[PDB]
């Protein structure tokens, strides 16, 4: 197993941990803030995924400082993860194209 494939796997594991802890911490941060909707675990997990993917429908979002901080860690974990898979795919295409030119 090559470095870029293990990093991708690692990144996917890590992002899943971030998604989970983000659900837990987002609820812990937003309860206590009147009007907040990000306050039960299942839908927080959905919110963390749609945040990590940068979709952002708008059905659920944090309104507190610490919930926004948690939000940012999720987004950056998401963008870095999905970017690292792209970097990994590129190393694969590039090695296969060195081979196919006899380098």
């Amino acid at each position, epitope marked *: 197993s090559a470095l870029h494939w293990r990093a991708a796997g690692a990144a996917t594991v890590l992002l899943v941990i971030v998604l989970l802890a983000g659900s837990y911490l987002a*609820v812990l941060a937003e309860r206590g803030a009147p009007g907040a909707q990000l306050i039960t*675990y299942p839908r927080a997990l959905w919110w963390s995924v749609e945040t990590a993917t940068t979709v952002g429908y708008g059905d659920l979002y944090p309104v507190t400082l610490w919930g926004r901080c948690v939000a940012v860690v999720v987004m950056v974990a998401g963008i870095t993860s999905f970017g690292l898979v792209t970097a990994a795919l590129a190393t694969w295409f590039v090695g296969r194209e060195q081979e196919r030119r006899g380098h």
Partner: antibody
């Protein structure tokens, strides 16, 4: 099984304080919230506050005079509610309830009847 | 905070008839409403969760419907064990709030 065990009664002199307890059994998860609900005789249900015992954070009903302080003891699976400086407005039945973090009170304690009198 | 209105306060029905309790929320709460029953000298009991989902141990007699702001708890064929106060409660926005109660009366 009985999943929440509360004492039946507490007499409290006006101005004094008292610490209600609520021992939980059954399944206990890190995600568990314990809620406290005040009901005055012939009135309805009034949400007082909530605590997450695995972390110790508590949030309170803003709309009513803060009479409560919530704590938990992770070792004994017991949640406490400290009601301080009571008047006859504070005489009521106080339930605790367990909420798995998904929004509803699946199980309730039998309630503790608090009487403020001399 | 979300205000839950339960009107009427008392509901008179004849045995075997079908009865319906209304819960109106002051703004849209999707389906995040739950129903409790409290008999004289009892503690509340979850009857229905998330507007319509069944709880195990609750007679099939009870059902729920509704979304958004208007919600209904129904009893197909009332009987005397159903005499009690019925409360709704939302979990869509912090803090959780309770309806004011409807007494069933036969």
């Amino acid at each position: 099984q009985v999943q929440l065990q509360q004492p039946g009664a507490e007499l409290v002199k006006p101005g004094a304080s008292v610490k209600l307890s609520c021992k939980a059994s059954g399944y206990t998860f890190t995600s568990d919230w314990i809620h406290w609900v005040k009901q005055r005789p012939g009135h309805g249900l009034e949400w007082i506050g909530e605590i997450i015992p695995s972390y110790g954070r508590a949030n309170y009903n803003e709309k009513i005079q803060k009479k409560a302080t919530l704590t938990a003891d992770k070792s004994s699976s017991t949640a406490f509610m400290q009601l301080s400086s009571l008047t006859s407005e504070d005489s009521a039945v106080y339930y605790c309830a367990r909420e798995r973090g998904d929004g509803y009170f699946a199980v309730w304690g039998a309630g503790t009847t608090v009487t403020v009198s001399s | 905070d979300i205000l839950l209105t339960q009107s009427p306060a008392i509901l008179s029905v004849s045995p075997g008839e079908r009865v319906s309790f209304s819960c109106r929320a002051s703004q849209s709460i999707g389906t995040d409403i739950h129903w409790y029953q409290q008999r004289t000298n009892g503690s509340p009991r979850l009857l229905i969760k998330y507007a319509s989902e069944s709880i195990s141990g609750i007679p099939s007699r009870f059902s729920g419907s509704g979304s958004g702001t208007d919600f209904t708890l129904s009893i197909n064929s009332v009987e005397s064990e159903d005499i009690a106060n019925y409360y709704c409660q939302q979990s869509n926005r912090w803090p959780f709030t309770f309806g004011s109660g409807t007494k069933l009366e036969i």
